[PDB]
Design a protein around this ligand. Structure first.
Ligand code: HEM
Length: 137
């Protein structure tokens, strides 16, 4: 279930973080413009940049802590507010996060592993709800 999926991802956070982030950018290439240093870079060039690895690891570590603090896939309002108030997210809208979650759930369904994809979809929906309540446009 969702708890085990958190353990799966955390066990190999590097690999899942890089693979899901790349899935997101591949599915929604226009999103790459927010990441000015990843423009024009192959997947291996990205994996060569210590800074890409560090970014993805920190994003997915935070995502897993938010997921783990959720109850029944309902995140804490305080965690949504962290995400809204981060300077790195200041021009984003909830549609950016929706797309992130569509890509993550599609990755899980395509992986041929037994992720609880329905629960990640619901967590994403509830997180998007919470982001909007905490002031994201
Ligand atoms: C729930 C999903 C997300 C989480 C948990 C998250 C978390 C984070 C964290 C922890 C950082 C800072 C990492 C560091 O200091 O190395 C970060 C940076 C950033 N995030 Fe997010 N983020 C999420 C979704 C998004 C989305 C959807 C976008 C845009 C489409 C985005 C754009 C950025 C940008 C541009 C940075 C700064 C990147 C850089 O330094 O090159 N984030 N995010």
């Amino acid at each position: 279930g969702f708890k085990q999926d958190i353990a799966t991802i955390r066990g190999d956070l590097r690999t899942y973080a890089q693979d899901i982030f790349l899935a997101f950018l591949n599915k929604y290439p226009d999103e790459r413009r927010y990441f000015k240093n990843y423009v024009g870079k192959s997947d291996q060039e990205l994996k060569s940049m210590a800074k890409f690895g560090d970014h993805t690891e920190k994003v997915f570590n935070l995502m897993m802590e938010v997921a783990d603090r959720a109850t029944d896939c309902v995140p804490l309002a305080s965690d949504a507010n962290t995400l809204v108030q981060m300077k790195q997210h200041s021009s984003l809208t909830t549609g950016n996060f929706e797309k992130f979650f569509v890509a993550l759930v599609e990755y899980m369904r395509a992986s041929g592993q037994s992720f609880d994809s329905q629960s990640w979809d619901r967590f994403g929906k509830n997180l998007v709800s919470a982001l909007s309540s905490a002031g994201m446009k």
